[PDB]
Every structure is written in C-alpha cells, then in structure tokens.
Design a protein around this ligand. Sequence first.
Ligand SMILES: CC(C)[C@H](NC(=O)[C@H](Cc1ccccc1)NC(=O)OCc1ccccc1)P(=O)(O)O[C@@H](Cc1ccccc1)C(=O)O
Ligand SMILES: [Zn+2]
Length: 307
Amino acid sequence: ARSTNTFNYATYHTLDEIYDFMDLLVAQHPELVSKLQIGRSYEGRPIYVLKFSTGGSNRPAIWIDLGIHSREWITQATGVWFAKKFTENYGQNPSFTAILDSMDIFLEIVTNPNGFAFTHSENRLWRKTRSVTSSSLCVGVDANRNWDAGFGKAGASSSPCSETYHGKYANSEVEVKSIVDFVKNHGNFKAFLSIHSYSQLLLYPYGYTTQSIPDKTELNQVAKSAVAALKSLYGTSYKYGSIITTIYQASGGSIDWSYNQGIKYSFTFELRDTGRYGFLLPASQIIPTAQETWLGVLTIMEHTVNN
Ligand SMILES: CC(C)[C@H](NC(=O)[C@H](Cc1ccccc1)NC(=O)OCc1ccccc1)P(=O)(O)O[C@@H](Cc1ccccc1)C(=O)O
Ligand SMILES: [Zn+2]
C-alpha cells in the first residue's frame, strides 16, 4: 500500500482503499492508465472508471464493470486484481499486448459505491442501490433491472421492497445513467462485460425474452472457448448460455441493452462459487478466482480484436 506492488490482493478492501489504489496505479503507470470520473452516485460518491490505453484517439474499446450488485464482493476484489494485471502484462503477454496496442479498456471496479459502502457498514448482503423511494421505507433499486432493454417486463418487480425492483423508469438510477451516457457518447465500444457472482456461469443475451439473438451461434462458440480456457487453470466448471435459459428470466439487464445498442460481444460472468459460500466467498479464493477469470476474459477480448 505504498505501491500497488505491496497492496494485498488476497483480502477484501474498503471503498477508501480501492479509491486510493486507483490513484496509486495511475501515478505508477502514467502512460497507460488514467482515472475518469463518469458521474456521482445517489448519495454523492464519485463513480470512477479506469482507462487503459496505449494511445490513439477514440480507439475501439472494451467495457468491463464489476460490483453493480454490492454484496458480490469477489467481483470488486477481482477488478482490483485485473487492474494491476493489466499493467503487469502489457509488454510481457504477447496477445494482451496486441489487444492494448489496438484497443482501449475501460474498467469500472465499483459500479455501485453507495451499496458497497453500505455492505461494509450496515448490511453485508445489500444488493441494490440506495435511492430512496419516499413512498416506501424500502430503499434502493436493482441497478441490473434498470436498463432500457425489455424494461418493466417479467423478470423484474414493481415493488420497491423487492430485491429485483426495476425503478420508476429506465435509467432512473444515476449509476446506470452514467454508464449509458458514457458508452453512447464514446460510440466505439466493441465488447461489454458485466461481472457478477455467484454461480459460475457465462451468460449472453437475452434475459427478457426466450427468442434467440441473431448472433447466438457466434456468441455460443466464444462462450464455449472462454469457459474452456478458464477451466484449464484449476478445473473450475462453468455452464454458459443465454440468461433466461441458464440462470433465469430477468428484464432490464445491462447486457441486453448493450447488445441492443449494437455491441455484439455482450457477456456477463457469474463468478465462484456454486452456493457453498455464495456471496461470502473466503478471501483465500480471491486470487485463484481472479486468475482463472482472466483467462476467460482474455479469450473474449481476443475474439473481439480479431473481428
Ligand atoms: C445469485 C446470483 C444468480 C445473483 N442473483 C441474486 O443475487 C439473486 C437476486 C434475485 C432475488 C430475487 C429473485 C430473483 C433474483 N438473489 C438470490 O438470492 O439468488 C438466488 C439464486 C441463485 C442461483 C439460482 C437462482 C437463484 P446475480 O445478481 O449475479 O444474477 C444476475 C443475473 C443476470 C445477469 C445478467 C443479466 C440479467 C441477470 C442478476 O440477477 O442480476
Ligand atoms: Zn449480481
């Protein structure tokens, strides 16, 4: 913590700790990474995105966000390891070097900071944002039911008290609108990855309809390859397939929106485990989870570079 080299990647961190880490990675790798503020949360916290870039102007780009659901702590812990990994492998890893020599990567480690801080202070199992519905005593909106793709349809709830409550209208949550404005404005995103836990699944569109996506054949083959690369390290098994078919029906999910904006490689990872620890995954599993997930993410980015 006097350098990202001495930061402890094998434990779970607080919001102050992860925000300070982003400042330190940018100070140590000024030619590769920068910190962008893309918005403010409902209670006033900055929403930051790390940009990894070799140069250029508006290059094709890859989006990755983690922590949209705050109790899924392995996802923010995996994102901190990804960020260091990126600065360790550029130059060393030949395909990763080749991706970053043609494209940029945007990494949002804490997509829901109010929920995150709330999981450290009052409820470890908090999922939603902290929007206050003054109609109810129930707080927050499920930010992964707030996107404008099948919004309001089966797979989300109209009660503010539901864990799956969609909000009063699409993009009502500022932490969803912040991504939406930034991605649309950028205009050159090629892949959109949103990481969750748990279940060990690789998911692609759609969640709000049983109809197949036009590109189902291609995405199924990328998912198949990505899941094989991941299992190569420690034998971890993943299942993959469309959201509605593989976990359950869900409307207003971010991957369905991005795919409908024309971003073809739209995938959600559900990380470890399959329920034995669930959201409370032991810290001794952070680095093995991050390492095998990298192999899965790298496979998809390779495919995106190549076509
Ligand atoms: C446990 C894991 C499946 C996470 N889900 C959750 O945390 C859910 C939320 C919920 C509550 C009530 C009713 C329905 C759903 N709650 C929950 O308790 O999960 C139980 C469960 C696990 C496995 C299978 C089936 C059910 P996750 O948030 O990662 O799942 C994604 C799936 C998804 C990804 C991408 C797009 C849409 C949906 C999501 O629900 O937003
Ligand atoms: Zn989730």
